[PDB]
Each structure stands twice: as C-alpha cells, then as structure tokens.
Amino acid sequence: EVRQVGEELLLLAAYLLSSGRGLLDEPRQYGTFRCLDAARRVLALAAGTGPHHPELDALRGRMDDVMCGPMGDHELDTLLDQMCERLATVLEDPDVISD
Amino acid sequence: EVRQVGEELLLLAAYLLSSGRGLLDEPRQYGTFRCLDAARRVLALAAGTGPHHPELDALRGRMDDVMCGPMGDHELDTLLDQMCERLATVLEDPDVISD
Amino acid sequence: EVRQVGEELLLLAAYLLSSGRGLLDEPRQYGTFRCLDAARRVLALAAGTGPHHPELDALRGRMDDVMCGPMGDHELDTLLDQMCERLATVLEDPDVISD
Amino acid sequence: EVRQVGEELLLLAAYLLSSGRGLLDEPRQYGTFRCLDAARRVLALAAGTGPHHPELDALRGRMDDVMCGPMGDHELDTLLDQMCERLATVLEDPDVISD
Amino acid sequence: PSQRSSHALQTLTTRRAVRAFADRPVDDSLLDPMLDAMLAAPSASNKQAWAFVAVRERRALRLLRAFSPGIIELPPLVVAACFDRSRAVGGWDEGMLCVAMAVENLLLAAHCLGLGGCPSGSFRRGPVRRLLGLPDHLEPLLLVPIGHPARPLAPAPRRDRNEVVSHERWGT
Amino acid sequence: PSQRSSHALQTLTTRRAVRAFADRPVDDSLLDPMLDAMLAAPSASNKQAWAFVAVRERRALRLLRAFSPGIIELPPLVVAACFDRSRAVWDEGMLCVAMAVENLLLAAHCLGLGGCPSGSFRRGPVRRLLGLPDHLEPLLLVPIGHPARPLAPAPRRDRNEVVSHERWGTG
Ligand SMILES: *Cc1cc2c(cc1C)nc1c(=O)[nH]c(=O)nc-1n2C[C@H](O)[C@H](O)[C@H](O)COP(=O)(O)O
Ligand SMILES: *Cc1cc2c(cc1C)nc1c(=O)[nH]c(=O)nc-1n2C[C@H](O)[C@H](O)[C@H](O)COP(=O)(O)O
C-alpha cells in the first residue's frame, strides 16, 4: 500500500514540476489556480490513505467544484481564505494531525 | 507508516493552499518557485516511502540547492525544463511505476 | 454594359495580383491551379458579353468541375493540354475571334 | 465595343491556360511573374473600357516596368504587397467599384 | 438514444466543403442560429479572444473575393474569423486554435440548415483587414464563405486510417 | 428536415467541456464512431497533414495526466493531436488539426461522452511518452470520457461585442 502512495507521489511531483515550467507562459492568475489544483490532488491522495475527517471531504468537494466545474466568475481573495482557514481549523484538531 | 504519510500529505496540502493565496501578493516569478518548492517537498515525502531511485535523490538535491541556500540567479525556464525532463526519465522506469 | 465589364476587370486584376503575392508562400503546384482558376473566371466574364460558342461553355464547365469540385487525384500535364487545345481550336474559328 | 472586349477576354483566357500548362516546366519563381504579367494584361483591357483612375495608370506603368524592363534585381514579396495595397485603395473608391 | 447519436454522427461525418454557391441569399433567420451555435466553441480560458464579421453586402463580398484567392465562387454570406490579441493568454497563440474551433462549429452550423462552405484561409491579410475595418489588435485568421450549395456533395479521397491514427503509441 | 436540423443544432450548442470523468472505460464500439467523426474534418489541401494517438492504457493515461497540467482528472481516453510537418504546405494547416479536435468534441457529445481539449502541456515529455517521431509535433491533448457531474454553461460575452455586421463596431 505504501508503494502505491509513493508512485502517485512521484506522478504528483512530475505534475508540480510541469506546472512550474508552464507558469512561465501562463497568464498571471494561474499561480494560485495551479496551487489549488495540486491541493485538491494531494487531498484526494491523502483521503485515500491518510486521516479521515468530514471537513476534509468538504474541502475536497469545494476544490472539485472550483476546478472541475465551470470556469469564470471566480474570486480568489476570499475563496482561498475560507479554504485555508477551514483546512487550518481541521489541522488544529489534535486527532486529524499528530504532534 | 501509511497514517503518518497521510498526515504529512495534509500538511503539504495546507502549504499548497497558503502558497496559492499568497501568490496574489507575491510577484509573478514566485509562482514557478512555489511550484518547485512544492515539488521538492513532495519528493521529500516520497523519499522514504516511494520507490528508491538514484536519479530521484539527485533531483531532490538539485531542487534543494535551488530553493534552499543562496537566493538569486536560477534562471527558471532552463532549470525547470531540465529538472522536469529528468523526473520524466525516472517515471518511465517499469519499477518506478507499475500501472 | 461596357462599364460593368470594366469593373469586373479591376476585381479580376486584383485577384491576379493577390494570387501572385500568394504564390510566394503556396506549395509548388499552385502556379498552374491559380492560372486555371483565373482562366475560368475570365471565361465566365467573357461568356456574359463576349462571343458565344458551345465549346467555350464546355471549357468553362470542365474548369468548374476541376476547381469548385473535389480536390485531389488530378493530373495537370494532360488535363491542361486538352483544355488549351480545345480553346485553341475554338479561337482558330474565324467567327469567334476577329482579325 | 462590348464585343471586342469579349474577344480580347478569350485571348487572355487562352494565355492563362498556356501560362498554367507551362508553369510546370518553368521554375517556381515564375508563378508570381506569370500572375503579375496577367495582371497588367487585364488592366490593359480595362484601360480603355473600365473606370479611368489616375492611380490605375500609375500602377499599370509599374507592372510594365517590371515585366517589359530588364530582368532580375526584383524583390517580389515587397513589390507585390505594395502594389496590391495601392490597387486596394483604388477599389475602395466608390467610383472604382460600385457594388 | 441510438437514433440521435446516429443522426448527429451522420451530420458530423457528412460535412463536405462547398465551393459552388447558388443564387439564394442567406437570410437572417438562417444566420442567427448559425452564429448562436458557432459561438458555442471552446475558448482558451473563456477569454473568448476572438472576433467575427458577418458580410452580406454584394459590394463587400465582391471586394473580399477579389482580394482573397481562397474564395472560388461568389458567396451569399461570409464570416471573417479573427483572433483578439487584446485578451491573449500569456501576453503563435493557443487561442488562435480556439478561433479555428469556432470556425469548425461554423461549418457544421452551415451544414445542418442545408448551407455549406469551406474554411478558406489563403487571403491577403492587409487588404482584407483594410476592407473589413479591423483595428490593429484583431488579426484575421479565416474567411469562411457560407452559402447555399449548388453542386452535389462529392466525397474526397482520404488517407488510410492506419497511417493517421494509432493506439497509445506510434505505429502500433 | 426541420427536426433533424433542430436536433443537430441542439447537439452542437449544448457542447460543454467535461473535466470530471467517471471511472467507466470507453468501449471500442463507442470509440470507433468518435474516431470516424474526428477524421472527417477539413484539411489544408486534402493533405490529411495530421497525426492522432489514442491512449487508453492506465499507466500511459496517468503519465500523460502527470505531464499535462491542462488535464484535470484522470481520463478514460486521451487523444493526442499533432501537426504533420512532413505533409505541411506558425502553419495554416495547424488550424485544421484543431478543427478535427473540435469535431471530436462534438462526436463525444454525439455519444453522450465529453472531451476537454488542452494546449497547456510540456511538449517534450509528452512527446517522449507518446513516442512521436521528430516531424510530428503534439499540439492538443483531449481527455475524453463519460461525464460524472452535470454540465453548466460558462459565462459568455454579449453577441454584439464578439460579432459585427459587415464592418467592425456595427451591431
Ligand atoms: C481552445 C482551447 C480550449 C481549452 C484549452 C486550450 C485551448 C487552446 N485548455 C483548457 C484547459 O487547459 N483546461 C480546461 O478545462 N479547458 C481548456 N479548454 C476548453 C475551454 O477552456 C472551455 O471549453 C471553456 O471553458 C468554454 O466552455 P464551453 O462549455 O462554453 O465550451
Ligand atoms: C483547415 C483549412 C481548410 C482550408 C483552408 C485553410 C485551412 C486552415 N483554405 C482553403 C482555401 O483557401 N480554399 C479552399 O478551397 N479550401 C480551403 N480549405 C478547405 C480544404 O480545401 C478542404 O478541407 C479540402 O479541400 C476538402 O476537405 P473535405 O473534408 O471536404 O474532404
């Protein structure tokens, strides 16, 4: 099971590198969008094997709606704030994350 | 060991969200650097759990040298292209990725 | 009536000039195709006001099939020979052309 | 006068067919030359019958110098673009082309 | 379910370029659905960095045909598709391909209603730009002549399927 | 006649990009009509100057997704459209390949599936995975698969801004 997670981590790292190279040609606003895409990918992978928390599933669902859904009419200042704060609150739970 | 991998994945996702939110304030050139930073962080997670390949260690060292330590220079079009290409060679190995 | 023909001649001259500029970028084989395209345009204008001969209409019909119709599987060595010879035979008629 | 214009149109069409057939043997660069040669021939027909515009006479002299003059030392890409642009201005004139 | 899939597949497959138009003008009732379905094409970022000009005046059509060797017969209607460099992504541009995709939707929009045309693109950009009044940032891409067909559709020879498409590799 | 035209126009208009794909695979019997519709697209000079690759293996799909940031979720099928430089007449014919890709998208909607073309990818690694020769240059990756979530239209500008009449600036 650990090996499968590692393989998907390698593919994820390749995606992050490709996004880094791509951002040198993409418009200004994709810096956050690619980070959000990678975040939802990581959360899918982590929900696969890592700690389970209902709010984390809510986070992944919101990211899926943002990305996999219609594009446009999206504000990034506030949306990212709520997403980051919700994830933070989850991580502050002594159970989801380990000291 | 899988549980610990998951908790570190949650931390990485939180870092990705924070980097995305911050990239609006940070200049455009920081998008690629944040992507590359996330790339080396992911490879750090996969170093002790994922497939062990010498070129993976070399690549992680490359990104470590670039992000950590001295700041400046580090032309990114060529650097990112080279790093991503090397990771591409790594991923095609049958042992690295099964299916 | 005479003025209308002249106006169509100016547009025809503009098409010939545009074809000349175009041929510097088009593949090798459009040197004849553009000449054939211009030829049928001239014959269409000439059939409107100039001398009427049944074989001249046959020429214009064959040219229309070649150009307006499907493209490909067309030979130019023989096809252009028969069309040029048929038009030469018509022009040799003392009635179609004036001394 | 309309009948004579038609007869000269038939001769021009025969010249277009003969030029096309020959262009196979002649090099590629002659494709533009034949089109330009046909352009001035067409304007000759329209000189005495079509609309009389001072720029049309100037253009006809331009192609006359290129063709009837010494061969070589001709930059076709710039010459054709400039000439076609000039004829365009002429055709935009409401008097040159009515509809 | 199978019947509509079959019909749409037949409509898409039996789309042949039309170069011999008839003497039937393209009415506005036959154009509004055409432009409506044509605009429903992918855009780079939903930028919609494109511009279209619908030409029907006989004078303008003749002037466009005269300066564009691509057009073979006088078209009742013309659609000039152009790339909007104002909203270009990253600044060849990928959005130009989206302009071409909208032109493909244009061709199918013409086929369904009985019209026809070809994505003509061999034209003098300068004279066409001056004729159609584009500003500096609108770069002409395609000049599709759309009109009522006059010649029966005639299929054209096509390359072997094995030499054009492959399965997850090349040559396999 | 009128009903067939109306149905076709509905099919063309309702075409929406699909970024979420179910874990269902694309059958060959369902892929063949899509390929036929895609190949029935205009070219530069009837030169058929293009190349298509139909990736369906799971490992190849995952590698392409990793090396193509444009792809959002793992697609059951990938169509790699490439320009054929050997048959070429910054290229006019490069637009015809995108036209073929558009036909493929509409074919996906013909069979109820959906495709999301993407041009934001690393040509080098993607070429290496696809095994394309030197002359062929990949230009579009089209993740295609059965939709998993309802599709909604994207915001669109007014028709007056994007479409004019016989001039520029005329409504
Ligand atoms: C033409 C084009 C469309 C793309 C591209 C790139 C090009 C050149 N890249 C995309 C991508 O990376 N991700 C993605 O999700 N879509 C891409 N598209 C499609 C286009 O953005 C959408 O079709 C657009 O949102 C319009 O949607 P629609 O439902 O109205 O067609
Ligand atoms: C894709 C394309 C098609 C063109 C172009 C330009 C492009 C980029 N230019 C054409 C032109 O100038 N004149 C013309 O007559 N056709 C043009 N076409 C269409 C092309 O010729 C057709 O695709 C082909 O002849 C037949 O295709 P088919 O699908 O009908 O068999």
Numbering used by the authors:
A (entry chain D), B (entry chain C), C (entry chain F), D (entry chain E): 7 to 105
E (entry chain A): 14 to 104, 115 to 195
F (entry chain B): 14 to 102, 115 to 196
From the paper:
Here, we determined the structure and mechanism of the cyclodipeptide oxidase from the halophile Nocardiopsis dassonvillei (NdasCDO), a component of the biosynthetic pathway for nocazine natural products. The enzyme exhibits promiscuity, processing various cyclic dipeptides as substrates in a distributive manner.
To gain insights into the structural organisation of NdasCDO, we performed helical reconstruction from the cryo electron microscopy data collected from a cryo vitrified grid containing ordered NdasCDO filaments to resolve a 3.0 Å resolution map. NdasCDO-A was composed of four anti-parallel beta strands surrounded by five alpha helical elements. Subunit B: NdasCDO-B is an α-helical protein composed of 4 antiparallel helices and, together with the second monomer, forms a dimeric 8-helical bundle structure. The FMN cofactor is covalently attached to Cys121 from subunit A through an 8α-S-cysteinyl linkage and sandwiched between subunits A and B. In comparison, the same residues were observed in NdasCDO including R32, N59 and S145 from NdasCDO-A and E32, P33, Y36, and R40 from NdasCDO-B. Whilst R32 is in close proximity to one of the C2 carbonyl groups from FMN’s isoalloxazine ring, R28, R29 and R181 also participate in polar interactions with the phosphate group of FMN. Together Tyr36-B, Phe39-B and Met77-B could limit access to the substrate binding site and FMN, as the bulky side chains obstruct the active site.
